[PDB]
Ligand binder design. Sequence first.
Ligand SMILES: CC(=O)N[C@@H]1[C@@H](O)[C@H](O[C@@H]2O[C@H](CO)[C@@H](O)[C@H](O)[C@H]2NC(C)=O)[C@@H](CO)O[C@@H]1O
Ligand SMILES: CC(=O)N[C@@H]1[C@@H](O)[C@H](O[C@@H]2O[C@H](CO)[C@@H](O)[C@H](O)[C@H]2NC(C)=O)[C@@H](CO)O[C@H]1O
Length: 369
Amino acid sequence: YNLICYFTNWAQYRPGLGSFKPDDINPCLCTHLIYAFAGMQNNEITTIEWNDVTLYKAFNDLKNRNSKLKTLLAIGGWNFGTAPFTTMVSTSQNRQTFITSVIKFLRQYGFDGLDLDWEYPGSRGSPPQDKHLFTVLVKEMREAFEQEAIESNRPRLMVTAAVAGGISNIQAGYEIPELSKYLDFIHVMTYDLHGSWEGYTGENSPLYKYPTETGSNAYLNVDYVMNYWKNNGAPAEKLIVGFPEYGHTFILRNPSDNGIGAPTSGDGPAGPYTRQAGFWAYYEICTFLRSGATEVWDASQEVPYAYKANEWLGYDNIKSFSVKAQWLKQNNFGGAMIWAIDLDDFTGSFCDQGKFPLTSTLNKALGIS
Ligand SMILES: CC(=O)N[C@@H]1[C@@H](O)[C@H](O[C@@H]2O[C@H](CO)[C@@H](O)[C@H](O)[C@H]2NC(C)=O)[C@@H](CO)O[C@@H]1O
Ligand SMILES: CC(=O)N[C@@H]1[C@@H](O)[C@H](O[C@@H]2O[C@H](CO)[C@@H](O)[C@H](O)[C@H]2NC(C)=O)[C@@H](CO)O[C@H]1O
């Protein structure tokens, strides 16, 4: 099985113990590390942070301590939008320009592949033709990587993609049968399935539906999303289940109503290191659990939640990671991807569970080491 671990090039700016750079990664935990994110300019891949080139080298230097480790560079993401992707795939000329720049970029800076993180073809302003043109891009990229590999005597560059976990986005964005033929792996973003945008509490990445859920609400679980991809043309062995090392936060309208579906108000509280409303890293969650919070096991969905006064948290822990790891193995899936390794308790000083408790749980459960 594969354990694919995303690293983010803005984590370096978190204060104090939150600051995370490539040298903080244990090179033996994962089979693949993915660098989030590269940008694009004039249909060519490019850096985004002032020190990306330095971080690239430290990132790929991790392979000096693990002969099996592979690295990839992710391009795009949520804030990147869709407009540059729409322009780049619109013509064969622009796709060739981009693909050519990618091969040169990855080989110069030491990456073993590219992870396409377009959010999303056919949505967020992307026109309908991008559903098919995305397949063309991946096909042309896979073929160009294959050519470069056989001519250079080097292992072929990987082409992967982070893909939507929302059914509406999936249907508008991906030709699953043909796309799955050319991607090496399909990293399914089976998280952000509930959050403060809904106005009530819900789990970030529940494995199963809540018992009373019907209709489109019954889409919002890992089991449904993964089986959607599998049953609509994707081979199970290429499908990678998304594992969040963070949770989503809410403000309860009434602290006395603190179950699943309890009413909530604004965007949710922010954490002292990630400093973004609605979002807590796992190491920030451990601090919350030690501040007097009540812990509850969501038995139907196989995930935890916790609350204290007016704050409510839906999240993942060792127990839920273990349940999902066993589940994905018994469903013949390709492994797990983690968003993101800089959100684990990488110092070990927050959770009293050792270093990288969530990532290590998957390392052991997936037979990585
Ligand atoms: C694949 C993807 O788009 N994942 C999202 C992350 O990008 C989000 O992180 C946020 O990313 C922006 C752009 O780099 C940063 O400016 C922002 O600080 C960062 N916030 C945090 C807490 O890391 C993430 C949270 O919004 O949601 C997805 O994971
Ligand atoms: C399954 C699904 O499509 N859920 C949607 C969420 O993804 C989305 O949340 C946003 O997700 C982005 C990654 O895809 C994050 O970068 C972004 O921070 C996050 N926005 C938040 C937490 O406010 C929400 C809100 O846009 O919609 C869901 O439908």
